[PDB]
Symmetry: none
Subunit: 107 residues, 4 copies
């Protein structure tokens, strides 16, 4: 039971501008609820703004540490943040590693 | 005849860079363009879970002879000794990572 | 001047369920205005529904026949329909060719 | 030990099918899985503008030993003499084109 899922005040809204494969950035808002539902809004930055929204349920891993959303995206749940992981749940390395953090709103 | 980049530039060749990756460290990219408007793309998705993509196809130029669209839908502005990846609208990508979208000709 | 752009009552709302690479289908609504603006809504069908929206300007080709949206997608404008084309503006062939038609709403 | 498809099936092998394509005729697909959880994918995007993709990488199984996720994010349900492509939620794809998501083992 000594998990992040139990330890952290994780329900809430997280925001960041994530790297985009073919655009300025993905202005991301990810809202998590205590009932393991979520709302993801992804704004692909550019002259037209293009907005992807998905709402659904997410799952916790067996360690109560990482979540997987219904769009397949994974996050490490941390103190005042979510860290988006690679397709297979590993931390994203390299020069842009910090760009994958979604900070709890107001921080 | 058209006073265009397509006609002005020695654009057939090999271009390389490391592009931003939506969910990985980066995309080590090698894009080879031929005069007959065929291309070959290699993309190594870097990180703890590496993969390699290789794409071959044809590309097309816009009416202005400036921008190319690859068969995978990616667009590039063809420039002097470089390609600049554009967004889906065909616009130059602005912001913090703008320079990360440049593929320079090999040996530069 | 003898073009589809001049001939057709093309402004309006077009709908269809397009093939999806990794889902049931893309329930698509594409609204075109006379001023060459558009609104595209794409619902990726499944248990969570995921919705992509983009609004912007579109361009006509020199023949006044095919349009290109700000997300890069292309359409042949026809009588009471739009026909989505491949990346390079060619008609999509094969067994599923008719699945790429967006019919004007009410038809 | 786990009573799972991963342990039950002779799943290493080559699977083929023609998948639906978002903006082309179809995707003639060949997916090769190895016992060490590495894969090779060939995808020919059919139509008037043909292109060929080749992807190599690793894949991972879910805890139930039933579903695999490739390094490109695609998921499949591993079954008897077939793979079934799943949606991004990992659910079986329903509707009019449901059977088009099956890749059968080669020679079937």
């Amino acid at each position: 039971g000594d998990t992040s899922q139990n330890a952290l005040d994780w329900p809430g809204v997280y925001e960041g501008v994530l790297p985009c494969a073919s655009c300025e950035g993905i202005q991301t808002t990810l809202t998590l609820q205590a009932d393991n539902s979520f709302e993801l809004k992804s704004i692909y930055l550019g002259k037209d703004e293009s907005i992807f929204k998905v709402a659904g349920k997410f799952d916790w891993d067996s360690n109560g540490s990482k979540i997987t959303l219904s769009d397949g995206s994974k996050y490490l749940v941390g103190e005042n943040q979510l860290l988006m992981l690679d397709t297979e749940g590993n931390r994203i390395t390299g020069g842009l590693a910090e760009h994958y953090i979604l900070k709890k709103k107001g921080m």
